[PDB]
Design a protein around this ligand. Sequence first.
Ligand SMILES: [Fe+3]
Lengths: 75, 101, 123, 494, 29, 125, 56, 100, 55, 488
Amino acid sequence: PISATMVGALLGLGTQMYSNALRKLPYMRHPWEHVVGMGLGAVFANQLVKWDVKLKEDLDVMLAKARAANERRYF
Amino acid sequence: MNTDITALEKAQYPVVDRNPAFTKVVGNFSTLDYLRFSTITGISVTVGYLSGIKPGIKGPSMVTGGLIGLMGGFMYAYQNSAGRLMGFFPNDGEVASYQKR
Amino acid sequence: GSKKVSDRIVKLSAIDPDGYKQDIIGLSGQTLLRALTHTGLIDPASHRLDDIEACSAECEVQIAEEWLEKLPPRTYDEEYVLKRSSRSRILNKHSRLGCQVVLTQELQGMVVAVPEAKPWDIP
Amino acid sequence: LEHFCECYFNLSGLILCPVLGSIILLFIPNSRIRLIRLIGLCASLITFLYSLVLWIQFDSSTAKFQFVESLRWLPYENINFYLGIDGISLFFVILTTFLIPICILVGWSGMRSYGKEYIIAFLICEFLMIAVFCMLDLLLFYVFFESVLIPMFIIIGVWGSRQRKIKAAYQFFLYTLLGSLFMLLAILLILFQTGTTDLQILLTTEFSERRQIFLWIAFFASFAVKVPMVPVHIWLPEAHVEAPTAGSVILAGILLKFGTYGFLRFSIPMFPEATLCFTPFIYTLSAIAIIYTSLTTLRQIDLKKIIAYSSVAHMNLVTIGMFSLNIQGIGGSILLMLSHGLVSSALFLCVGVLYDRHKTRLVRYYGGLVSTMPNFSTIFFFFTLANMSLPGTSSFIGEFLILVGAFQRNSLVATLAALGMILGAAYSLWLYNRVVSGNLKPDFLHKFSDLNGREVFIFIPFLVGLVWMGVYPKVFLDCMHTSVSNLVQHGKFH
Amino acid sequence: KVSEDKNRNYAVVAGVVAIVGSIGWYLKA
Amino acid sequence: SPTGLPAQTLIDRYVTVGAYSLLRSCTIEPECIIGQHSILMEGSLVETRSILEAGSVLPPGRRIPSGELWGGNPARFIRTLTNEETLEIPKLAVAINHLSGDYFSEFLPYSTIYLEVEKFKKSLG
Amino acid sequence: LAQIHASENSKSFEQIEVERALRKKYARKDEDYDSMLGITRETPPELILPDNVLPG
Amino acid sequence: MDLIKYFTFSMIIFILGIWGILLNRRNILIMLMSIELMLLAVNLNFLVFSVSLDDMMGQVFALLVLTVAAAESAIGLAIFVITFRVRGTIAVEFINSIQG
Amino acid sequence: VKVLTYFGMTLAAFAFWQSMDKVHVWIALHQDEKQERMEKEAEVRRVRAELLRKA
Amino acid sequence: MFNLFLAVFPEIFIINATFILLIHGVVFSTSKKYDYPPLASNVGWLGLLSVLITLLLLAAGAPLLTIAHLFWNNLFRRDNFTYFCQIFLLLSTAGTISMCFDFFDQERFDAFEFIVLILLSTCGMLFMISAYDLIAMYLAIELQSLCFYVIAASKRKSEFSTEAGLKYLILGAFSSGILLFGCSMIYGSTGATHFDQLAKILTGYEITGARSSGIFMGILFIAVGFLFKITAVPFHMWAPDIYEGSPTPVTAFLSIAPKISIFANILRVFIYGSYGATLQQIFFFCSIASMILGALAAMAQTKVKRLLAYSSIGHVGYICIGFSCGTIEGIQSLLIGIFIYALMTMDAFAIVLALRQTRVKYIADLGALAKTNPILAITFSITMFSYAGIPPLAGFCSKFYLFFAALGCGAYFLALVGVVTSVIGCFYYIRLVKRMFFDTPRTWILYEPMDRNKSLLLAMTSFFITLFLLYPSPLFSVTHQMALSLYL
Ligand SMILES: [Fe+3]
């Protein structure tokens, strides 16, 4: 389907083309950089997904402690 | 000078050594630690060389970048090794060597 | 060829801040600032557009009253710019924004005074 | 809760089509003008066909939202958004998908100077306008409605004919933004009570009469600007006149419908008690706008100003119908909304035909055109009649049904609203005669060309649609009555 | 037959070391 | 320049200089068309939205007023341009730039001649 | 004029490279930082045209 | 009444700095000196409070604020020198170009 | 200034500081009225909030 | 003993690297043998590398930064809130440095000491974030401020740069003196400078009738100093003049990093200490003044840099509305607003530095940019619509909160001010889009294309600005984490 890897690869390729266009260069100037950008974007998207999962776990632990501290009031 | 290594957040892994000595942490350097060290140092030497071409000092710039990379890579490797010995990072190999010696 | 650039030429005299008189040349229908930048009396790089929205009185010149009646009266925006760019915040009656003065044939021989350049290149 | 749909043709693909077209057109060089034109036109046409298929699978017995598909925002699933349509929004999706290819075809000849930016702006507008009409959430409706401001601003400012477009684009942006800001406040106040913005939940929640009144005022502040109601309608003549032709078509045919759509989707069903309290207030504002703006139209001298001002009077008659709160009034209000988007769009196309050739909008220059452009004169007369709500045209069906629904509630407002039959006839025929009838004036205009093959084809679906609704509105009313009936009954149990 | 610039050669070695080390770093983590 | 103005050659934006034309210290204001095989001499000025026919000759210090079509040797007034004709000038410049895009696309940043030079050098020792 | 054009067109590859580097080196300036260092950068003679071709 | 008297000594120096700002709109060097008077008054506050509370933290901070005051004065006068060197004068009418 | 002017300004400042001493003694002497007035204003607020919650 | 310093490993590394770069620069810039080479770009690349290695050390050592917390307690306090704030500060500094190489090469700004002072101020802001005592807070603030005074006057022959530095030193030293006077009052009244001690002394009482006026005025003066630092009205007039007069990379750096660090200080001092209502009313009234004044003054500007300065003043007003409400969602929204404003400002200053190669100064200089560089005009229009808060761009997020708190804390005058100032801001932002797209000037300015660094940074920030509302979960989660970690 629409995995993180594909979204990241597309974003990285688009980032290399956008950069070339902002510099008035042909869209495909230095194609090996387009390959590098695809790889880096894929890696970044997958790592962002993993980091988001980890963040949620940490937040749940923090929210559990906050609710325990708040429930201590009614003791 | 009174000291206290106790951290705010407790180590989540078996504590092999609470306050490992400097030479003990250096001797605990693993293959991955040396890989991190070498990668940081090599990148730093390369950046020093490439940024030194225009002013004409690629060699001295290479030495400067390599020194920055050597200090940073050694500090990173020490960080990881000491964290493993202290139980802050996953330390399977440290525990396997500890339970035997 | 029945149509020369000399038909549009306007003769003019500018006095530089060191008090020396020079004979400058400009085309009718173009601003006094363009004629002034032809010789480098005013740095063209300091005033590249002829718009009041791109002017901090880098084009300001002083003109005697005899030539001031041969010009349209200063606009509110022009006086605002001149007054605010003054170091003393005082509107000089003989000051005109060179970017807002269009040369015409009735301004032949007009004499203009060019003050010291203000700083214009913002870091 | 993944409320995904089992149908093959769904709303997500329709929303994605013009977006894919725009993305592809991003990367095509401006030297490949033929390819840019073809790709844009084909993307818009496939979107039109897709929407027709959505019509085909519509179920006209249910009052539930159809083709409902859920789209998830956070893996926490607390905030999750839904898309769906009913008999009230289906034809507006269809109208958007139909008008966009017309907008591309109108600028076909100038496409070598417009560039891919023109097509991309219109394709982006299409995506947002389809989405706005397909939203089951107050917050997403808000966010998608403001998104259209950016491309509409660009369209008006870049491709407008003269420098009054600067002021026009400013006024359009600022008025619309102000209105959308009051809607945001109400959305956040609703969210404070209910903890949600899901429309279906809101339709099942009870509001206090005090807070119903207040939230209704907050919705009115945005919708009355969109409609537009007096005295916040003065942005319309500037924006609709200074826009390019296709821009005027989009502005009058689709964007104007968003305020009345917002009255039918949010204010009227969600706050039934406040709606009853403000019914004399809406009746008064609409009646004033109909009488006053019709008389201003009479005294306009610009071709595009007469058509723009006519749009205000037609839209305020729509509000009388929807606030009559019965089958005829709300049914007629939706039909007039659809009819206006065809009639006023066709009328803006007639004026643009004249402007592209002679480059003037002043009525005084024209006249006598029947002797040089009989084809345009005949097509112009037909849409002139449709603008007068002549029986047999699409606009008469909606107009009379609204008057029926208004008469059953208040005979005075139906009487004042029926005065537009006299006034609307006066300015439409005076416009037609001063442009088409009489003698030519060779000192102003001496060289003439009638419509070409592209302009005649452009007018064909407008003639067919106007006739088709005017003689057999049953194909539309049948698919609407179940949703209309439940909108009227919302909030009462007897 | 031989590349003479020594500083260039050392830079090349550093770049290769960085690439192989990054690959090993991924492979062992 | 004989006119006394600065003597740089300025070819402004959206200007089409027809093939085989000679320009020496002339100013062409934006959106003009210079006909093929034309000659613009020192200090001459072509004002904006003007067109010159092919084979025109503009002597030193002469001027082509805006919105006009000129031609001949020496150039003479012919007719005033209509609005549409003047709207078509930047379209001509844009179309020529679109054509030049095809020629720009045929050249990679570097050539491969240096390889031919290398083997020529090797085949000589 | 022929002298400067002939001098340029007959330069070898090595001299072309030397002058390209020099031209890039002296294209802009920082006379403020130079005065801080107490040095005066001088345009190399191979980038200076003879006075007989200068406009004055 | 000892503590109030030392405190009012420091307070008068602080107020004198404020007045010196208020009273020298043509004299930017005196403004810099007024700021130094305020800093001195604050240092005195810290030392007096350290004595009054029998606490050393006020003395540690007084020494560090001394270092900061010296650094501020050195940099401030450097900027004054380059401002004068560029303009040839210290008059306030030559340092008002940036505005609006 | 003249040296005598600096001396006279010092004398005036000495007088000012002795006046400040008198002000400080006056403030110290009226701590009890401040305390008694504060007793009222806080207790009024108590009797007040207590009465306002009886309903 | 050595393992205790694991908590200061990032700072130790960055300081030592700064010393190495200082020595390298001064040794080879004076060398006759290498013909006194300009070293600004060389030391810039090496310093960017140093910042990235510092970031690696800090982010990969999250639990180790809390080691020996009792030994280090009287010096600083490292926690999750500080962890994320410092990561964001290092990222800002790296981006700003990467945006300076074209300026070094083309204007020939050859001073490498520029990079050294930027790195030293980065050290100062890193220490600011972890500050947990009034003394340490003041010291770190002064270090950062002194570095800024020197870099604001870096173009030492320019009238504008010298004027900017002079106003910065006088107004900055004045504000610092006021803040130091507040610290002295608090210390005299409570006998305490540590944030924990101040917390214990001040909680439970606020204004309990017999309020310590010493504590109250210490708080007021410290608040005045903080408000000067964040350029809140009426302590703001130094900002537009210094932003204009400073070299543009300095303006870009001063726009982002100091705000991150000072807001970290404000949170840990006020939200954590306990005087209460007055403190939040201070920020409420200053937020309102900032929004109104920023909107009007920006509407009056004709130069790009001044417009950006006034826009930043208005946006700090919007952010401080979050601190005013004093709830968990208030802190979260403040952090989200800071992050989005920082990325947007980085986008805007990347574009400004790109156009500074052809000396952009006025808004009218951007005429016909949609013809000469259409993709740059689109990228810049996206930034302006994001600044104006038009959904679904990232700028909407911050605007959405403003009204959420206004209807949450029950404040409709704030809501009305927000509606009017948002409309005004929209007008003066879309005026730039009109200039680049709708105008047909007689004279055009052709701009040189930007370098690779700025194009890559611009592409990334523009993709973030257009697409953040599609996947906003990580920022929401991390800011909620930081807001919670302020207390637990
Ligand atoms: Fe001017």
